[PDB]
Design a protein around this ligand. Sequence first.
Ligand code: PLX
Ligand code: PLX
Ligand code: PLX
Ligand code: PEE
Ligand code: ADP
Lengths: 98, 107, 347, 48, 54, 459, 42, 320
Amino acid sequence: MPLVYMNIIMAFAIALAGLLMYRSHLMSSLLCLEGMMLSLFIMSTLIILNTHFTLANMMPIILLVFAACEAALGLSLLVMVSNTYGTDYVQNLNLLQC
Amino acid sequence: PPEPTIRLQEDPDPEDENLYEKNPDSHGYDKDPIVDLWNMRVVFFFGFSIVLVLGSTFVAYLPDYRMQEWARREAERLVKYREANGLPLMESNCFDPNKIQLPEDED
Amino acid sequence: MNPIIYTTLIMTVMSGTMLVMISSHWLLIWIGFEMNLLAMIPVLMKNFNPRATEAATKYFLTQATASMMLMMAIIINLLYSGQWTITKMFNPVAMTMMTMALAMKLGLSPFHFWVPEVTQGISLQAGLLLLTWQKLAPLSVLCQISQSINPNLMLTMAMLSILIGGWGGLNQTQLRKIMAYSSIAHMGWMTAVLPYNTTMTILNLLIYITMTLAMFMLLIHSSATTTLSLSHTWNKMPVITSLMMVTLLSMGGLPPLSGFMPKWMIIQEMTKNESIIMPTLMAMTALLNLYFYMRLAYSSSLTMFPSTNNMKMKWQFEHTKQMKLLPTMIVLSTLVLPMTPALSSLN
Amino acid sequence: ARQWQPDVEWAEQFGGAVMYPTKETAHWKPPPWNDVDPPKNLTLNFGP
Amino acid sequence: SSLLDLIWLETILPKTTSFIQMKMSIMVSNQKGLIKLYFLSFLITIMISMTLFN
Amino acid sequence: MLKIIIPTTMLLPMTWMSKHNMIWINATVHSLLISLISLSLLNQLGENSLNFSLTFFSDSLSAPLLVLTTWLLPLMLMASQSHLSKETTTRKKLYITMLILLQLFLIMTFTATELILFYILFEATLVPTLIIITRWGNQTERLNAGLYFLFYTLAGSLPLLVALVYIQNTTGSLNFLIIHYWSHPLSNSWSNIFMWLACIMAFMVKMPLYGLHLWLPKAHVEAPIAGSMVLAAVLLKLGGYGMMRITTILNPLTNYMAYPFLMLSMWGMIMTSSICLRQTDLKSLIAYSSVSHMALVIVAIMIQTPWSFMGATALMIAHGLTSSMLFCLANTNYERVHSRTMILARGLQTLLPLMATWWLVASLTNLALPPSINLIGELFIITASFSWSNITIILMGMNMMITALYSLYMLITTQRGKYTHHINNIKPSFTRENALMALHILPLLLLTLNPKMILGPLY
Amino acid sequence: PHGSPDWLKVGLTLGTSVFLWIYLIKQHKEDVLEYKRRNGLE
Amino acid sequence: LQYGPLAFVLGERTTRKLTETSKVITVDGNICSGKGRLAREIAEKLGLRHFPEAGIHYADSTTGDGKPLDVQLSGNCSLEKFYDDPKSNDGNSYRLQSWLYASRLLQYADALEHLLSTGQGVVLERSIYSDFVFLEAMYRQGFIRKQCVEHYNEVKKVTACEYLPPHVVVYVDVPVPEIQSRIQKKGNPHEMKITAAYLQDIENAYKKTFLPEMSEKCEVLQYSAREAEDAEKVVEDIEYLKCDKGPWPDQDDRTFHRLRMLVQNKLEVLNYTTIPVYLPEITIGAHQSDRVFQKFTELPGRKYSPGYNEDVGDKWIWLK
Ligand SMILES: CCCCCCCCCCCCCCCCC[C@@H](O)O[C@H](CO[C@H](O)CCCCCCCCCCCCCCC)COP(=O)(O)OCC[N+](C)(C)C
Ligand SMILES: CCCCCCCCCCCCCCCCC[C@@H](O)O[C@H](CO[C@H](O)CCCCCCCCCCCCCCC)COP(=O)(O)OCC[N+](C)(C)C
Ligand SMILES: CCCCCCCCCCCCCCCCC[C@@H](O)O[C@H](CO[C@H](O)CCCCCCCCCCCCCCC)COP(=O)(O)OCC[N+](C)(C)C
Ligand SMILES: CCCCCCCC/C=C\CCCCCCCC(=O)O[C@H](COC(=O)CCCCCCC/C=C/CCCCCCCC)COP(=O)(O)OCCN
Ligand SMILES: Nc1ncnc2c1ncn2[C@@H]1O[C@H](COP(=O)(O)OP(=O)(O)O)[C@@H](O)[C@H]1O
């Protein structure tokens, strides 16, 4: 496994850690999710092109579309939360607790 | 302090009702005399008369499925036989050694 | 919302789970998970209020992260061996990633934190759906790749789930939180037997779904979401409280009720594999779940709590709408122990 | 002469946010009876 | 009656178990509901899982 | 064996289809008839057993317990008839249903040819009795009592289940006949030590063993009268029956694994006996007397000699009858005074002479007065312990002393002396209570004439 | 409220029960004959 | 086919029934004022259904037989004892207030159900809205405690947050001396004990709080005693005004479906009237509750569901 795959996997892991940090600003959470998706798209495209697996050239597009739909959903949720509080801070979402 | 010292709306604790006052010779089974008399009668008949007496006489005359007298007679004839033939009464071995195969030691 | 739109959304959730269950390609399984998540969000927010929106955003965040790591596991698996079929993973690193993604999707500890809060936020019907239907797809995927899993990690999460559910349920007055912690413990029990027998996993899943359906329907019938609100139920509908007590006794694993069937068999199966310490710990831990079920029973049906005057008016009205299959769920969740050997149907 | 049944004081044990109150969780409050929390047009000046 | 039966036999088996379970339940269920802490724990668990198990 | 199981089940529809004022009569009469059917089981044979089917089997150890279980239900109905008078018809039917279900599980547990079925029914009994205690109990402590009676039990019994399934995976069966015939010795190992502990602790908790007995005084004091009768008479004997059954796979480990338990009993039976000397509650005193008698039964079972087993069977039957009678007497006093404090109502021989003679005979049977079966069990166990070690006699001997002492103390505090002046609601004894007393005590003095019926399979 | 026995529902319920019982009896007979023919009993 | 999601799916839309005549009117006036006579007249002229003011036994009239039940089974409160001894130790005042608010809430649900299911509008006396004035009055006279008013506020918030306020609120203004004279000529011994301050407080409440808050979200017709007898002018005023500020124009077919599901199923309407907050005036112990519920079940047609009582005369039980 060459170093390009290693760099893409490292980027995915960095984005996952950034999502799990939650300094504030749920918009940053969505940004980290979509950075993870971008890394996934890049690495899947590289693998599929490298192995000349023709029928799987379908797969990256599909992934993109589905993930983008999720972003839409996430954005909607963020917007609604802001309408209740005036801002999208993470610490506003403490009404429900363990 | 305008509180009523009443923590909630509760019934007072009812007092024990005597079964004898409304009905002497009450038998203590029920507050309806007819049902009470019949409860007494069924309890006494089926407990004392049926189970206690008939069950006891059934248990007394249970046939000897444990074979007490059978073992007595068998021991009697064995003792008679071993006395008549000079055998040494009970033998110290429960199983005859002829068909027990001990492991040879060779130690 | 519109009844047609609600029916369409529920059908889309069902179709996502079925697409996960019937497909042999990893991309289509991931697509089923995506469709299920996409259609599940509005259902959690059918009754609009800030709490439901917070629950929905927490649920979306957790499920989206799980889906991303799911996708990551699939890609890594593809890189090492160029296969898309769902079978035992060809890479050890990919397998662990797959395992934690499904652990988040189910709610296994330490990925359990979202379940109590999401269950509290949503209504009772949404909670019923979330705690029953939303466990089928991840568990089926886990069953399909059970020969690949590392037993150490999987059993660690199972035991952690049982312990965490038992401890967290003891501190709850809200009924939805109690249900969430109970579900966490039952997920732990189910996942403790995947490495050894998936039939036992399915048997536990079916029994648990039956009991959870009965419990949620009984909680909906007597529309109570707290301990004290349920303590008033004897003053209107005591049969409901008696059925609820018997169901709670069954859910605690007391023989000869139905809830004793899974643990028994699970314990039995683990003993076949020379595992003795883990089943013992699991049973002694399930005693905690039994304790807070017993506390609920004490508060609901074994003692009569003070009532209120306005309850008198409620005595004059009947339930207009009925849950069908509620009697069937109660009977199947209390009295099916003699039918235990039917599990050979590979249920 | 009567069987004991729970009173208001016994029922208060199960009315809080959580069992076993702690110093930290003492300030927690039970949720609203219905699961609804209180919510708690811009001006433009087109000058010369 | 008092020293052993009412005090020490109580203290050993039932009271100790009740105390420990209460303390553990308090520790487990005292979560502020802030997802910052939750996903920090998730990162911790994820990192630990990859390294420790294999 | 279905000829007893089916009628007991049919007791339920008959109770639920009865008129609102005929439930007690029908239940009592039918239950008594079922008890009569149980007598046929006694005609046991000196060889193996009455193997009725693949599922159930009877034995000269199981037969006396079955007969006592069937006989106890009519007496519990008679005792419950009084305090449930102001109770709704549906809830009275529910109470009778709990008693019938409890009897059904108990009858089944004894035939229970396999150990898993026995475990399932052994734990099934825990549900109706818990409902009885925590629903129809007077004080506020009943809830705690219930919890204790639950968790103690399960804490001992969940490991047993594991052990049980483990055995079936190694030997291949849990049928008692196959276990007995294919028995093999237990090697001295740590794993074997823990399997021995898992097998023993479940039954040792329900005896109860001294130190593990905290649940019993609670669950007996805050239970209703029927609950107390069934707890002391039969439910305590499930542990002894299970120990007698399961110790066939525990040899020769028991030859030294029994030391911690024997001690806990031999000293414990002293301690609890002394506890009876300083007691302010009748029910608590009777509960502690139960603890002492079951400590002696534990010693008998752990010694594992034919005389030990005969004495333990006899003592279990005798203690069931005597403790049920004592609880019924205490409840007759309680339903008049509503206090359950032994010092409060005094001088009752002057007001209730026939209750006084019932109290005397109950105390004399608790006394272990020859030639009662209580003495027969006591003496067989004491002789076996003397053969086990000549020093045990001291403990045994002193125990007898204390027993007699507190027993007569209970008779002198409540019956003798001067009547309490301010209590003026001591109405004459009902025919129901005198009939209950006679139906407890006459079977004891009838069993003392045919001891082989209750001396177990080693007779 | 105020409602007469809905004879349509009663008819459907009894008809479903009768159809199920008849189909069950026929199915059991067919299994018995098929098993006998396969194993050569009768 | 009872109304549900399937009926809405097939044909059932209630926006096709609204004909601008719905216009739920509510009439509010101080005790002894002729609001009832006026309300009845308005309903007669406009073709609407009049709802007589809810009493202690309003709910008794809609379920089973319309006859009221015993006081111990229905309400557990009396207005006569409130007038006689408003500061009693058994808390009749607040129990009466709470039962009347529940009755009022129940009546409003029935009125909304009729208006939505048929399209014909309705006329009401004192509704859930303006029920609070008796509350405030009882606090200002010292009859009830502050805990009672906080519990009332909690229940009122949670319940009234789900229903549409009336279009037209009609207030008949009659001064306190005039209504005192009307009470004195009434002859009712218990009504004669209403003190001047209590009547003033009721009058004060409408003017201080009820009239202004309502005017911000609906249209108000404040009338004096003299201007209230001539109902033709009242109807003219009602028909001339057009409601455009309330939530009613914003309602649509989906919101109508949710509201129509809410108004039926009276158990869901009354769900929050019994929240587990323990006030000594309204909380009832287990023994009393048990025996009273048992007595209620023993009533002739109250053991089973309405179509399953043989004693009242239900037949064909074994086939229903
Ligand atoms: C009040 C004043 C007194 C009036 C009465 C005066 C008369 C006195 C007579 C009473 C006692 C005097 C002693 C006389 C004893 C003779 C009877 C005895 O011999 O019979 C016994 C027989 O008794 C029975 O064996 C025991 C009775 C059964 C007890 C069962 C209890 C009843 C069921 C109740 C439910 C069970 C609950 C407890 C569960 C275990 C033993 O006889 P046995 O020599 O051996 O065999 C019988 C003959 N054979 C040889 C032909 C076979
Ligand atoms: C309360 C206990 C659970 C509820 C019981 C079910 C109640 C409702 C069921 C109504 C009918 C459902 C049956 C479905 C009809 C056709 C089934 C057929 O098409 O599918 C078969 C499958 O059918 C099921 O196997 C049988 C279902 C029977 C469930 C009951 C047994 C539960 C354990 C015993 C509890 C006692 C319950 C009995 C009293 C009702 C073939 O399975 P297969 O595609 O090749 O393998 C996939 C599964 N794998 C992966 C595990 C191998
Ligand atoms: C509170 C009321 C009662 C509750 C229950 C009390 C009863 C449970 C007590 C358990 C019975 C005995 C346990 C172990 C018995 C084994 C024999 C041992 O005690 O003797 C020595 C054992 O040696 C040492 O004792 C090693 C053990 C030391 C550490 C264990 C802790 C011992 C006391 C703890 C008791 C705690 C009770 C409650 C726990 C929950 C012999 O040494 P050795 O001949 O070389 O090895 C023989 C065993 N082999 C052959 C299998 C190897
Ligand atoms: C009344 C409250 C009491 C609470 C419970 C007390 C009972 C404790 C008894 C032990 C519990 C588990 C026993 C296991 C069941 C039997 C199965 C068995 O014997 O298998 C053993 C397994 O042995 C064990 O695993 C034992 C580990 C015990 C773990 C739990 C510890 C419980 C407490 C330990 C200290 C005190 C123990 C007794 C306390 C008595 C009650 C106070 C060996 O099998 P293999 O491993 O396959 O063969 C050997 C070659 N590999
Ligand atoms: N919310 C309330 N609280 C207390 N009493 C009320 C309440 N509403 C109405 N009442 C009383 O109910 C009686 C009837 O109401 P009202 O309309 O004023 O008299 P009438 O029926 O003769 O027109 C009156 O005595 C009134 O005071």
